[model samples]
Target chain A: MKARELDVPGAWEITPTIHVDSRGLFFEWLTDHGFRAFAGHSLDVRQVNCSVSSAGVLRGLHFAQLPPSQAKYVTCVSGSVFDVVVDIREGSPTFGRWDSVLLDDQDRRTIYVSEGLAHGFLALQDNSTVMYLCSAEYNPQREHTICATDPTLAVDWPLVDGAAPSLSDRDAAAPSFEDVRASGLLPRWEQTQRFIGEM
Target chain B: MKARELDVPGAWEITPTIHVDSRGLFFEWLTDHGFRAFAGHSLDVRQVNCSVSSAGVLRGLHFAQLPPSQAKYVTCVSGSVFDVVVDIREGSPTFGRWDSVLLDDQDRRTIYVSEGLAHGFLALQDNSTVMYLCSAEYNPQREHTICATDPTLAVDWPLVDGAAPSLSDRDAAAPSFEDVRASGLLPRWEQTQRFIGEM
Candidate 1:
C-alpha cells in the first residue's frame, strides 16, 4: 500500500496494491506497521464502522471534542462514495478548508483524517457501502456537527443531476460552521496536536 | 428505554420503547442520559459502527488491550442476531463465563459491554444489520481475538440444526481461550477497572 499525505495537514490518502485473479480481488485495506511508517504514529482504531446508504444520501460534517477527538480511516467497501474531510480545527493554517476523495470498491482507496477534522460523505449509488476505522468511540456529549450544506463552507457535494441530497433530521438541523465556531465547539489545532502527542 | 442488568457484571441489556404506526416504527435505540441513569457512569462513546451480515456469518470473539480497551453498546437494526458477551477479564469472578442475547429489529434491544469482555455474534437472518457505539477506536497493536468456538469457553452458539457457523479467515484461525489466557493477552479485572475510572 502507498500512503500519500493530503493537501490538508494530518490527513492522508492511501492507495493499496490490488491483486486480482480467478477467485476475486485482494488488497491490504489497512496495516498497522505500514500506516505507522507513513504517519509517524500508529492509528489506534478503537472502533470499526460500516454504513449502507442510498444514492444522494449525505451524512456528516461531523466531529468530536478534544482530549480524545475522533480520527478516521474511511473507504468504500461495496459501492462508491464521494468522501470528504474538512479542516475544522480552529486556528489551523487550513481552517474551514475541505478536500475530497472518490472511494469505491474498484480502487479500494482509503483516507485518513486526524482528530479535530470534520468528515462527511455523499453516497453515489444505491446500497453504497462505506466502512471506517475510528480512533475514538462515539461520545454523544463530545459529538458535534456542522451542517454539510453550510452556506459559508459551500461544500461541493455531488448530486445526481437536479436532485437534493437526503439528510437525517439531526443532520439537516445541524448548525453552520460559524455557529459552531461561535459556540466554541470546534477543537483548537494546538490542543488537538498536544492530545495526539500524548496518545 | 428500559435497562436490565445482564448475568455478567458491567453489562446491561437496553430495551427501547418502540413506537410503531402507519408510517413506520420508531425507537430511541440509544441515549446517553438514559444509559447514564442506569449504568451510573455515562458512556463516553467515541465511535459508531454498523455491519450488515448474511445468515450464519459469525464475526468475533474479539477484544482489545488494557488502558484503552473497547466498550460497546450494540443493537440489531434490520434483522436478528444471537449476540454473546464473554467475561474474559482474567481473575474476575466471571472469567470464562458467557451470556447471550437475542437482538432483533422487533424488540430493538441493545447491550452494553465493558472493557476486557469478548464479544461475537451470529447472524440469524440475511441482511442482518447490527449497529454499535464504542468507547474506543481501533488499535491494531492492542487488538486481540479468541476463538469463538473454543471448547474451553463452550459458548452455546445457536446454529441451524447442527450446521456450522460461517467465520472469516481470521476468526476461524483465532487462538483458543486457554491459549489467550496463557499468553497473558487477557486484561486483568483490576487493571480494566482502573482504566475505566480514568476514562
Candidate 2:
C-alpha cells in the first residue's frame, strides 16, 4: 500500500496494491502495521459504518466536536464519489481550504480524515457505497455541519451541467464556514494538535 | 447490535441498531465492545477489505489454513448478497450442512464467520459490494476453496432463472466438499475447539 498526504494536513490518500487474477482480486485496504506507519498513530477503530447514496446525493461538510472528535478512514466500495475534506481548523494556514480525491472501485483508494477537519462527499454515480472505520462512536450532540454548498468553501462537486447537488434538510440549513469560526466553534489549530496528541 | 448463532456452530449473524433520519443513516456495523461480547473474544482486525461483484457473481466457499485461520466479519454495503456459511469441520454436529442469510443495505445485517468454517456469497444485484474486517492478512498460500455448487453442499443460491452461477477459474476448479475432508484438510471439531480456545 502507498500513502500520500493531501493538500490539507492531517488528511491522506491511501492506495492499496491490488492483487488480481482469475479469482477476482484482493487487497489489504487497511493493515495494522501499514496504517500505524502512515498515520504516526494506531487507529483504534471504535465503530464501523457503511453508507449508500444515489448519484447527485451530497452529505455533510460535517465535523464532530473536539476533545473527543471523530477520525475517519473511508473508501468508496462500489461506485465513485467526490470525497472532500476541508481543513476547518481556525488559525491554520489552510483553514477554510479543502482538497478532494475521486475515490472509485477501480483505484480502490481510501481516504483518511483526521479529527477537527470537516468531511463530506458527492456521489458521482448511483449506488455509491462507502465504508468507514471511525475512531469514535456516533453522537448527535457532537455532530455539526458546515454547508458544502457554501460559496466561500467552494468544493468543486462533479455534477452534470454544474447543477446543484442533493442535500439533507439539515445539511442544506447548515451554517456557512465562517459562521462557525465567528462563533468560536471551530477547533483551533493549536488545540487540535493538543487534542490529537492526547488521543 | 444483536448477535445470533446460525445453524452452523461457528457462524453468527449480527444486526446493528440503525440510526436513521432525514440526513441519511448511520449504524455501528461493528463495535469493539459489542463484537467482543457477541463472539466471546475481541476481533483483532489485521486487515480490512472491500470487494464489488456484479449480479450473479459467486465467490468463495473459501477458508484459510488452520493454526492461524481467518475469521471474517462481513457486510454487504451496497445492493444485496446471498451469504453462505458451511460447517466443514470434519466432526462438527452440522458437518457438511450449510446455512445462508440475505444480507442487504436495507436491514444492514452482518455475518461473522468464525475460524474453521467455509464462506462465500452470491451477489444478488448489480454492483453488489461487500466489506470485511479480517482477523488475519490475506495469504494465498493458506487460501483454500470448497465448491459451493457441489451437489453435496447444495447451497440454495437465489439466482434468478435458477441455474449454475458464475465462479472464478480457481473457485470453479476447487475440490468438492468431501474431497478436502478425505484428504484430511478439514479441521476436526475437537481441533477447532482447541484452536479457538487457544486464540
Candidate 3:
C-alpha cells in the first residue's frame, strides 16, 4: 500500500494493491504494518458509522469543540459523491481551508481527516452511500455547523442543474460565512498552516 | 496523546492534548514523533484535498483499482459525522461488513483507514465538513462506486423523517446488494481481518 500526506497536518490518502481473478477481486483494506510504513502510525477506531444519501444533497461545514475533536476516515461505498474537509483549528495558518476526494466503488479509495478539522460532502448520485471511522463519539452540545453555501468558502460543487441544493433545517438556518467570522467561530488559517508545515 | 488499536487491524485513532488560553486555543493536530512512536515509520503526503457539505448529504462507497489502491486518514474540522469503513478485500470473511465513528469538532479525534477497504459517511448535521490527504494523485479511470441503499448490506442509518432517503440518479439506478455479490466484486473479509490483526 502507498500513502501521501496532505498540506493540512494529519490528513492522508492511501492506495492498496488490488488483485483480480476470474472468480472475483482481492485487496487488503486495512493493515497495521502497511499503515505504519505509509502513514507513520497504527490507528485504532473506537466508533464506526455509515450513511446513505442522494445526489444534490449536501451535509456539513460542521465540527466539534476542542479536547476531543473528531477525526475521520471517509469514502463512498456505492454511488459516487464528492467528499470534503476543512481546517478549523484555532490559530492555525490554513484555517478555513478545505479539500476534496471523489469516492466511488470502482476505485475503493479512502480519505483520512485529522483532528480539529471540519468535514462534509455532496452526493453526486442517488443512493450515494458513505462510511467512516471516527475517534470520538456523539456530542450534540459541542457541535457547530456552517452553511456550505456561505459564499466565503465558495466550494466548487459539480451540480447537475445548477439548482439550489437540498439542505437540513439546521444547516439552512446556520450562520453565513461573514456571520461565522464576526462571531469569532471560524478557524485561524495562518497558525494552523504553520503547525501543519512542521508536522 | 492516547492511541488504541481497533478491531479492524491497521485502522487507528489518536487523541491529542489541547491547550486553551484566553487569547485562543493551542493544540497539535498531528505530530511526526507521536505517530512514529506508534506506527514505527514516517510518510510524506503528495496531495491534499477538502470538501464541504450540509446535513443529510452522503458521499462515497469509493475505492481505487489495484497496483494503486488508496489509503486515507479522515477527520472532522467543523462539525460532527458518522464515519465508517468496510472490509472490501476479496475472500475475507466480513467482506460486506462495516463499522463507524461519530466524528465532530469537540472531541477533535482522528482515524486512519489503511489501504484496501470501502469507505464513506452520513452527515449528522449541517455544514459537516471532512478533509483528507492522499498518497496518490486523482485517477478517474481507477474509480468506482456502490449503492449505499443496497438491501443486502442493510446499513442502519439515523433517519431524518422516518422515510427512505433521497438518492442520486446513479444510486437510484444502482444494482442491488445481491448484484454486487453476484458480480463477484466482494473483497475477502476474513483474510483482510486477519491481515489487520497480524499487523
Candidate 4:
C-alpha cells in the first residue's frame, strides 16, 4: 500500500498494494496493523455506510460538532466522484484551505477525513457508489452543514454542461463559513485536537 | 435489515434497510450491534480484502486449517457473482452439501462465512469486484485449497457461452474431497465446533 498526506492537514490519501494472479487481482484494502502504522491511530469503525448517487449530484460541506465529532474513511466502490476536504478547524494555520481527490472504482483510493473538517463530494457518473467507515455514531443534534456554494470557500465544483448540480434543500439552505464561525459553532483547532486525542 | 440463514449451517445472507432521497440513497452495510445480534458473534475485522475478476473466472472451494481458521463477511460491490459455500467439516450433517447466492451491486447483499466452511465464487460479469472482512489474519502455511471443479462437489459454475472458466494452477491441482478426508486432514464437525466456540 502507499500513503500520502493531502494538502489539507489531518487528511491523507491511501492506495492499496495489488497482488495479481491468474484467477483475478487481490489486495488488502484495509488491515488493522497497516492502518495503525500508517495513521498512528487505530480506526474504530462505528458505522459503515454507502451512498449511490446520479451524475451532477452534490452533497455536503458538512461536519459534526466537536465533543462528538466523527471521522470517516471514504472510498469510491463503483463509478466516480470528486471528493473535497476543507480545513474548518478554527485558529489553525491551514483554516479555510481545501484539497481535492478524484476517487473512482478504477484506481480505488481512500481518503481519510479527520474531525473538525468539512467533507463533501460530487458524483461524476451515474450510480456512483461510495462507501465510508466512520469512527463515531451519528448525532443529529450535534451535526451541522455549511454551504457548498459559499463564495469565500470557492470550492471548484465540476459542473455538467447540460445539467445543473443537484442538492438537498437542507444542503442548499446551509449556513456559510463566515456565518458559522461568527456564531461560535465552529470548533477551534486546539479544542478539537484535545477531544480527538483521547479517542 | 433482513437476515436469513443459508441451507448450510454457520452461514447467512443479510440485506440492508434502504433510505433513499433525491440526491442519493443511504444505507448501513454493516454495524457492530446489528451483525452481532444477527449472527450471535461480533465480526472483528482483522483484515479486509478486494478481488477484481473477469467474466468466466472461477475461484476457490477453499478453507483454512483448524486452530487458525478465518471467518469472512463477503459482499459484492461492483458487478455480480455466484458465491458458494460448501460444508466440509468431516462429521457435519450438511457435509458435502452446498448453497449459493447471487451477489451483485444492485441489491448489495452480504454473506457471512464461518471458519470451518468452504467458500468460493464464480464471476458472472467482467470487472466483477468483491470485498470481504475477515476475523483472522491470513496464514498461508495453514491454508488449503480444494478442487473447485471436483466431480463430487459439482459446483454449478455459470459458464459463459464462448469462454472457459479460469482457475489457478494450484487450485486446478488441488486434491479431491475423499483424498483430504481420508488423509485425516479435514477437521471433524465436533472438533471444529469446539475450536470455533472461543472465537
Candidate 5:
C-alpha cells in the first residue's frame, strides 16, 4: 500500500496494490502497521460505516465537536464517487481550504481525513457505495454541518451532467461558512491537536 | 414512532411512521428525543454509516472491547435484511441470548443495540443496504468477533432456500463462542454497564 499526503495537513490518499487472477482480486485495503508508518500514529477506528447513493446524491460538509472529533478513512467499495475534504478546523493555516479525491472500485483508492475537518461527497454513478472507518462514534449533540454550497468555501462537487446536486433538507438549509464560524460551531485547530495527542 | 423492546435486554425495535406519496417516502428514522424516551438516555452517536450488500452476503458477528464498546441503531434503507443481535455480555441475565428482526424498506423498522452485544446480518435481497448510527467508531485493535455458525449460540440465520450462508474469510475463521469465552475476549456485564453510565 502507498500513502500520499494531501494538501491539507494530516489528510492522506492511499493506494493499495491489487492482485488479480481468474478467481478475483485481492488487496490489503488497510493495515495498522502500514498506516502507522505513514501517519505516525495508528488509527483507532471506532466505527465502520457504509453508504450507497444514486447519481448526483450529495451528503455532508459535516463535522463533529472537539474532545472526540471524528477522523475518517474513506473508500468507494462499488461504483464511483467524488469524495471531498474541507479544512474546517478554525484558525488553522488551511482553514476553508478543500481537497478532493476520485474513489472508485477499479483503483480502490482511499482517503484519510483528520479530525475537525468537514467531509462531503457526490456520487458519480448510480449505486455508488462509500465506506468509512471512523475514529469516533456519532454524537448528534456534537454534530454540525456547513452548507455544501457555501460560496465562500465553494466546493467543486462534480455533479452529473451539470445537474443540480440532490441534498437532504438539513444539508440544504445548513449554515454558511461565515455563519458557522461566527456561531462558534467550528473546532479550534489547537484544541483538536491537543485532543488527538491525548488520544 | 413506536419503540418495542426485543427479547434481548437493551435492544429495541423502532417503527417510525412513513409517509409515502407519488415522489417517494419520508420518515424520521432516528431522533434523539425519540430514542432517549425509550433508551433512558440520549444516544451519543459518534458515527453514522451505510453499507450495501448483495443477497447471501454475511457481514459480521462483530463486537468491540469494553470501556467504550459500540452501540448501534441499524436500519435498512433499501431491499431487506435479517438483522441479528446477540447478548455477549458475560454474567448478564441474557448472556448468549439472541434475537432477530426483519428490517426492510416497507416497514422501515430500526433496531437499537446496546454496547457489548454482537451484531451481524444476512442480506435477504439484492442491493440490501444497511445504515447504522453508531455510538462509537471503529477500533480494530479493540475489535473482536465470534463465529456466526457457532453451535453454542445456534443463531438460526434464515438462509435462502436452506443454502449455507456465505461469510468473509475472517468471519468464517472467527473463534467459536466457547473459544472466545475461554480466551477472555467477552466483556463483563458490570464493566460494560459502568462504561455506559459514564458515557
Candidate 6:
C-alpha cells in the first residue's frame, strides 16, 4: 500500500495494492505498520461505524470539543461521494481553510481526519456507502454542530442541476460561521496546540 | 492505548492514555508503537485535514466507490457533534443498520469508521470543528451522496423547536430510503464469512 499526506496536519490518503484476476480482486485495506511508516503515527481504533446515503445527501461541518478530540479514518466502500474537511483550529495557518477528496468505488482509496478538524461530505451517486474508524467513543454532552452552508467558509458544494444543495431542516437553519465565531463556540486551534505542547 | 474490534472484520477502535499533571495534561493522541501493540496491524497515514462548521449542519451519508473505499479516523478537536455510521454493504446480516457516537469536548474521544460503511454527522452546537485522517486523496469522479433524512433509516436528529430538522434544498429533495434501496444502489453487508470469501 502507498500512503500520502494531505495539506492538513495528521490527515492522510492511503492506496493499497490490488491483486486482480478474471474472477475478482483482493487487497489489504489497512495495515498498522504501513500507517506508522507513512503518517509517522500508529492508530488504535476503538469503534467501527458505517453509513449509507443516496446521491446529493450532504452531512456534517461537525466536530467535538478539545482536551481529547476524536480522530477518524474515512472512505467509501461502495458507490461514491465528495468528501470534504475544514480546518477550524484557531491560530493555525490553515484555519477556516478547507480540502476535499473524491472517495468512491473506482479508486478504492481512503482518507484519515485527525483530531481538531471538521468533517463533511456530498454523495454523488444514488446510493453511496461509506465506512470509517474513529479514535473516541460517544459523548453527547460535548457534541457540537455547524452549518455546511455557512457563508464565511463558503464551501463550494456540487449542486444538482445548478440548484442549491439540499439539506436537513436542522442543517438549513444552522448558524453561520461568523455567528459561531462571534459566539466563541467554535473549537480553537490554540487549545489543540496547548494540548500537544503538554504532550 | 486500548484497542477494541468492531462487529465488522478489519475495523477497530483505539483509545490512548492521557496523563495530567500540575504543569498541564500529557497524552499520546497518535503513537505508532502503541497502535502496533494493540491493533495488531500497521497503518501509515499520508494526510491531515481539518474542518469547521456552524451549529445544526448535517453533513454526510457519503463515501468513495470500490477498488479503494476510503477509510477514516474522525475526532472533534474544538466543538462537538453527533457522529453516525450506517451499514449498507450487500449480502450482510446487518445491512441497512446504523450506529452513532456522541463525540464532543468532555470525553475527547474519537470514533473509527472502517472501510465499507456509510458515515455522517449532525452538529449539536455551533463552531463544531472536526479533524480526520483519510486513507486516500480527493477524487471527484468517484464520489456519491445520500439524503440524511431517508425515512427508511429514520435517523433521529435533534430539533430546535420540536419541529422538522433543517435541511439543504438538495437534501430536502433527496430520494427516500425506499427509493434508494429499490434502485439497488445501497451497499451490502457481509460477516467475516463473506469477507473471507472475497479473499
What is the i-RMS of every prediction? 8.0, 2.8, 15.4, 1.7, 7.9, 17.6
Candidate 2 lDDT by residue in tens digits, B1-199: 7799999987899888887654356667887778878687778777887766776789888998887889999888777899999988887779988998778878989999999899999887776777888888788888798987888988877884575587887888999887888887887889878888863
lDDT of 3 by residue, A1-199 (tens): 5666666656777665665532133355554456556445544544445555666777787876555556677766457777777766656666666777777766767778866677787777765656665556556887788888767777777784676667666877988766766777554545434433342
lDDT of 6 by residue, B141-190 (tens): 76556678776777767655444444455555766657766776665554
lDDT (C-alpha, whole model) for all candidates: 0.78, 0.84, 0.62, 0.85, 0.80, 0.64
Index of the highest-TM-score prediction: 4
How close is every model to the real structure, measured as TM-score? Answer: 0.58, 0.82, 0.48, 0.90, 0.60, 0.50
Pick the winner on DockQ between candidates 1 and 4: 4
In order, the TM-score of chain B in each prediction is: 0.95, 0.96, 0.80, 0.94, 0.95, 0.79
Candidate 3 Cα errors over 4 Å, as ranges? A37-39, A182-199, B1-199
| Reference-based lDDT, residue A109, model 3 | 78
Off by over 4 Å in 6: A193-199, B1-199
Per-residue alpha-carbon lDDT of candidate 1 for residues B9-122, written as tens digits (9 for 90 to 100): 878888877654321333455544576676666665555455667778888999988777888888775679999999988888988898988898667688888888889899
Per residue, candidate 4 scores C-alpha lDDT tens digits across A3-95 of 788988888898888778766687888887887875677777767778999999998988998876888889888899999999999889999
Say which prediction, candidate 1 or candidate 5, comes out ahead on TM-score. 5
- State the local distance difference test value for candidate 1: 0.78
Residue pairs of candidate 4 with colliding backbone atoms: none
Instruction: For model 2, state the Cα shift of residue A57 in Å.
Output: 3.2
Question: Chain A of model 3, TM-score against the native?
Answer: 0.83
Docking quality level of the chain pair in candidate 2: acceptable
**Please, what are the lDDT tens digits per residue for candidate 5 over residues A1-199?**
7788888887899888776432134455566557777767766655545566778888898998887788888887667889888988888999889999889877879999888889888888876767677777677889999999899998877769899988888888999999999998898989878876763
Query: After superposing candidate 5, which stretches have Cα over 4 Å from the reference?
Result: A1-3, A14-54, A57-79, A87-97, A104-119, A127-156, A164-199, B1-3, B14-54, B57-79, B87-96, B104-119, B126-154, B160-162, B167-199
Sorted into a CAPRI-style docking class, model 1 comes out as incorrect
For DockQ, the strongest prediction is 4
**B89-140 per-residue lDDT for model 5 (tens digits):** 9999999999999998678788889888999988888767676766666678
**Candidate 5 chain B worst ten-residue window by lDDT:** B19-28
Output the better candidate (3/4) by TM-score.
Answer: 4
For model 1, residues A75-134, the per-residue Cα lDDT tens digits are 876568998889888889988888898898677788998888999998887667666767
